[PDB]
Chains A and B, each alone.
Chain A
């Protein structure tokens, strides 16, 4: 007693009281995101310490902004980022499924059932559940080109149904699909630029098959040079075209004024040599990451050619990929190949700002979005919904297998597990039965949000599925059930498969905890 084993302030709890308290803790996390699911879901508004406000419907984003410190709840936060980093859609579905798994086995833990028996039960059905999804997934391996452009649109619209831009999903889906089909075979996400300019209606958004970026800081004389060309040649640079000192490690020592005047004229002759080398190559538009001096701009003005400096790195790489040139750090080898060709260049006004447009490139590998909102959080929320459409199409390209949504898939799995538990004896019958009950939370949370009789609809759905109607889900508008595969409610097979494994792994990990020790500070 006088010398205590562990330092003072150490917290230690264990047993059934500790484990049950973890189950109830995860219910609060699943509560924050519960009513954000469905064609009729809401948003949440969160304000941090500094007063900045964020309005979002993305499930993964809400959990990040919460300051969760409960060790067991942090597991549900991480699986949200897991679904975010792999498929990008289904961050709330994997959260509700996680909480429902734990709540349905909670009474058995009170009865004293050994958790390792519970763990074996979860891992048994997941291999059955996953193998059921792959069997009944619908695909057409024959390569029809117009069916592919229709399948991707149906997948894209269904990913936008629960977002702020639902009223224009048919308009945005066409824009998103066109973006991906011309984005190479590796599909770098940096090859797509999303810009945000205030003012204007939502239908004024546009897609430019080229590169467009913001006007940069320009020196005196920028305004006497033309702002439109038809067949210009673009010379991309990484060289600072301004009068300066050659090397920071340089030093000049001289005796006579005759050399003094010769040295003063030496700096000008260097600068005029580079600018004369560019002008002879026949290029009309010059872009450089480094600053462009006023002398260069005035010189570029006298010959009706356009200059731009301090262009961001990312915007330059997209311009090279869209025009087809190369960055040059020297002005001695400007061959005809290192230049970029576009079909028209112009500078226009967009909502109070000035933007440079490079449009008309037939060999482009890059697009750019111009989003028009009314407030800062209006376009930020708009881009977060666009990102869900981009990633969904990217996955669908690699594997074109879809299943019907709207709760149709959760009832086919639950019926299958219910018809398999009755075959096996023992406590393995109750655990799998409780597992199959947790799979019908998704159809219940859709009806609860909309405002129907959630009890009646589930009874109708359960009878249709067991009658032998595989793809029957919920009808939001008609307050009934209907086939969602002929109603064009699709989603890739990857979204559900990645939903089960992450949900099953989180439930198994939490149940397998015995005691928690927290040491001071």
Chain B
């Protein structure tokens, strides 16, 4: 009578539940698996993964965010690591795989503390304290470098460091040049802001990867309307239009009544005359080429050719606003409003033809100072093109941060080792049971040098121990792991550079994520 089956919750039998420590331990095991899957893909000697889509598409990639995005997961904690990776990618764009390894190794160190009888709020509080001590020391060893178009060598070195981890490294000296120049021709220095909508990345298969080049103009996937037009002009004055080359039509519902033969003939004359006035109106302004957003009629197409005037048909929306910025012209919605002050200028407009295919493209080049620019990517496989696009996007984002903040630190594990010693130094003065949390933080901060050494083929424990002792005897906080086997351990001489905000985001974001995982003690799932 006391405990006969009484229903409290809908579908009471089908729901499971985990309480207590067995809840926390299950989260730790799920978190560790994600970190061990992506431990391999860290550092210049890292390896890649080959994703497979729902339908069968193949994608080979090394970017941290994409792997966790294309992956399909079920465990709720796993989705929390996916959202952690994306947040870092949006804010910075570099350091997506480093953060999840730091976050994973930060949870692993907490398993022993939980077993020894520490309330996880004490652990969560301790991690927060350590991060604050680590961050304030991080910008004590920073070095402001430069932001100026005159030199551009420090900016190339930073771009080289980020590209050194991808398949683009085969020619990363060339690709670094393209990336830095693209930012500095769109960058607004006073507002300290760059807009990526003014940089168009387009790739076409075929050719060679080294054929990638920077075009300080616009490339469109179109051609001249009439097959017999000339394929190039050299003093193009650009007339950008928005209305189609057809007789007018009001939008409101309307009807025109033809009641006699003279009415019919007056309508027939009005048709053919209307075709003439638009083309006459274009030519008197001195324009050399016509660009339109909508189609042309058969009569209007030939008349353009008969007046020696090349034109383009059915261009896109975003393309038009780029050409207006690139060529410096203006957009007109009617023929009547066209003047000679609204035409743009262009040094060269050409149609470039590729090999066996019928694909043809139009390129606008050699204008004056341009706030718009495009990147052209070539390569022998669609999988290179996708990889080249993502890797180049990594380079552009890093340069953007140098615009925002112009001080850097030296990567290769030098920053992590130096930070860990500072945290460990502070841990010897805090006696209120929080010392154990701090030593666990510092030990989890060395997981990045371990991941670098293991991939390079050395022994982790020996290699880190020698480096840390040297940083104590000498006063050099710029010694890292010699992953490329060059002989020296000073990352300043080897020219390895990473931005400051990249590091501050990695540490601050991971610590705040653990403070949410460690705070969960219950779970309810419907069974399957």
Contact string, B329-344, partner A, CB cutoff 8 A, digits 1/0? 0110110000000000
Q: Does A230 contact B (CB under 8 A)?
A: no
Contact with A along B262-294 (1 / 0, CB 8 A): 010011001000000000000000000000000
Q: Is the CB of A55 within 8 A of B520?
A: yes
A28 at the interface (CB under 8 A from B): yes
Interface residues on A, range: 35 or more
Residues 116-134 of B, flagged 1 when their CB comes within 8 A of A and 0 if not, give: 0001010001001000000
CB neighbours (8 Å) of B513 from chain A are 374-375, 378
| Contact between chains at A253 and B520 (CB < 8 Å) | no
Chain A residues whose CB sits within 8 angstroms of the CB of B520 once the complex forms: 42-45, 55
Is A35 within 8 A of B333, CB to CB? no
Q: Counting CB contacts under 8 A, is A141 at the interface?
A: no
- Is A9 interfacial (CB-CB < 8 Å)? no
Let me know if A252 and B255 touch, CB within 8 A.
yes
Total interface residues on B, CB under 8 Å, equals: 71
**If the complex has contacts A68-B8, A70-B8, A202-B512, are A47 and B250 also in contact, measured as CB distance less than 8 A?**
no
Interface stretch of the complex, out of A170-178, A326-334, A345-353, A410-418: A345-353
> Which stretch (A124-132, A182-190, A261-269, A312-320) binds chain B?
A261-269
- A200 within 8 Å of B by Cβ? yes
- For A251, the closest partner residue in chain B by CB is B253
Would you list which residues of chain A between 240 and 298 have a CB under 8 Å from chain B?
243-246, 250-257, 260-261, 263-264, 266-268, 294-295, 298
How far is A24 from B6 in the complex, measured between Cα atoms in Å? Answer: 10
Is A302's CB within 8 Å of the partner chain B?
yes
| Whole-angstrom CA separation of A198 from B269 in the bound complex | 62
Stretch at the interface among B33-41, B319-327, B439-447: B319-327
A487 within 8 A of B: no
- Known contacts A252-B254, A264-B248: A223-B9 contact under CB 8 Å: no
Q: Does A221 contact B (CB under 8 A)?
A: yes
Q: Which residue of B lies closest to A168 (CB)?
A: B128
Give B84's nearest chain A residue, CB to CB.
A374
Are A53 and B6 touching (Cβ within 8 A)? no
Which residues of B lie under 8 Å from residue A469 when comparing CB positions? none
Q: Which of A17, A222, A252 contacts B250 (CB 8 A)?
A: A252
B299 part of interface (Cβ distance < 8 Å): no
Q: A69-B7, A223-B197 are in contact. Are A35 and B91 (CB under 8 A)?
A: no
Contacting residues of chain B (175-193) with chain A, CB-CB under 8 angstroms: 191, 193
Whether A223 pairs with B317 at a CB distance below 8 angstroms is no
B128 touches A167 (CB 8 A): yes
- Contact: A45 with B333, CB < 8 Å? no
- The proximity string for B residues 17-32 relative to A, scoring 1 for CB distances below 8 Å and 0 otherwise, is 0000000000000000
* With known contacts A45-B76, A45-B522, A352–B331 Cβ distance under 8 A: no
Centre residue among B128, B505, B521 by max chain A CB count within 10 A: B521
Does A252 lie within 8 Å of B253, measured CB to CB?
Answer: yes
Is B198 an interface residue when CB atoms closer than 8 A count as contact? yes
Given contacts A44-B522, A164-B515, A267-B250, 20 further A-B contacts (CB under 8 A): A67-B10, A67-B11, A69-B8, A167-B515, A198-B86, A199-B89, A200-B87, A200-B91, A202-B512, A203-B508, A220-B318, A220-B331, A221-B324, A254-B255, A255-B256, A260-B256, A264-B248, A267-B252, A302-B330, A374-B83
Return 10 A-B CB contacts under 8 Å, by A number.
A25-B8, A167-B125, A199-B88, A200-B505, A220-B320, A224-B321, A252-B254, A253-B254, A257-B270, A267-B252
In the A-B complex, the 10 residue pairs with the smallest Cβ-Cβ separation, listed nearest first, are A199-B91, A375-B83, A67-B10, A245-B252, A252-B254, A352-B90, A42-B521, A201-B508, A199-B90, A374-B87
Binding site for A on B (CB under 8 A): 1-3, 6-11, 76, 79-80, 83-84, 86-91, 119, 121, 125, 128, 191, 193, 195, 197-198, 242, 248-257, 259, 263, 266-267, 270, 317-318, 320-321, 324-325, 330-331, 333-334, 504-505, 508-509, 512-513, 515-516, 519-526
